[PDB]
């Protein structure tokens, strides 16, 4: 996250970090005690992944961290149906052992299709993660967060040569300087509704980071909430 601020411990208790062949390579959000939602591009069918909830500073021990192994990965069925489009960039991760919910490990709420869209349209959401804090620069040690405004579809479409599908939305500032970035993928874009946060998007892709005239592209969660609920039921 470029141009953001340090989160306070427990401020985004749904946020998780994914570790694998590369450390702290993507983020995710807690759906329930056994499931994480992230971006499909982060989880290339094959390699082993670990999830850490209750994380704050990646180089220190807070004694709030809960590490779990991923035993099953479900990328959306239409991701990579086409090549290099980033469409349907969303995936679900099943944990080997249930997370233990507490003040530092709490799920993000997920509304139905209609309300998730209503919440996104409020027009202001938070993005967070441990990704780059500068275009082509170092990754964050302490979780970063940033409030970003929704960008109207035409300006969105008009800002890039790449196709922005109906499963995506743009968010960011006209002047640039503040944006999600590499390493932040899979993290949540969330909308606070009277003190309760709802998942409205997944950090997905962009061109460089925080450049003026460019915006972050996000997976539109409203289009996928039925799928998230069908796959993450606990027995």
């Amino acid at each position: 996250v470029v141009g953001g601020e340090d989160a306070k411990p427990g401020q985004f208790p749904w946020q998780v970090v994914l570790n694998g062949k590369v450390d702290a390579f993507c983020g995710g959000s807690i759906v329930n005690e056994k499931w994480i939602v992230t971006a499909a591009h982060c989880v290339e069918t094959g390699v082993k992944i670990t999830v850490v909830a209750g994380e704050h500073n990646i180089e220190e021990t807070e004694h709030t961290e809960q590490k779990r192994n991923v035993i099953r990965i479900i990328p959306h069925h239409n991701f990579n149906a086409a090549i290099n489009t980033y469409n349907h960039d969303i995936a679900l991760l099943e944990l080997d052992e249930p997370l233990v919910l507490n003040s530092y490990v709490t799920p993000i709420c997920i509304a139905d299709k209609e309300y998730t869209n209503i919440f996104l349209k409020f027009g202001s959401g938070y993005v967070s993660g441990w990704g780059r804090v500068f275009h082509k620069g170092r990754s964050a040690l302490v979780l970063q967060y940033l409030r970003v405004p929704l960008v109207d579809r035409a300006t969105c479409l008009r800002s890039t040569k790449f196709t922005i599908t109906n499963n995506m939305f743009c968010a960011g500032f006209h002047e640039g300087g503040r944006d999600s970035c590499q390493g932040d993928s899979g993290g949540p874009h969330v909308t606070e509704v009277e003190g309760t946060s709802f998942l409205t998007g997944i950090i997905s892709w962009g061109e460089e980071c925080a450049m003026k005239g460019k915006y972050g592209i996000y997976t539109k969660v409203s289009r996928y909430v039925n799928w998230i609920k069908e796959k993450t039921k606990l027995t």
Binding site: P13, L101, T106, P107, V190, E194, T196
Partner: protein, 59 residues
Amino acid sequence: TCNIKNGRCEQFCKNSADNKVVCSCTEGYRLAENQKSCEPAVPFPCGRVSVSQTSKLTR
């Protein structure tokens, strides 16, 4: 009706009969007594900060 200020519902609203509304909440919450607000029904309901933050107030 749900048209104005979400029917006064803290979370979800649905138009019912005779121009009136029925509020509901997401998982982990229950509709309060006033029929509009959402209160936690589990110890750690989704989407809320419970560390509360800081250590210097009346609390």
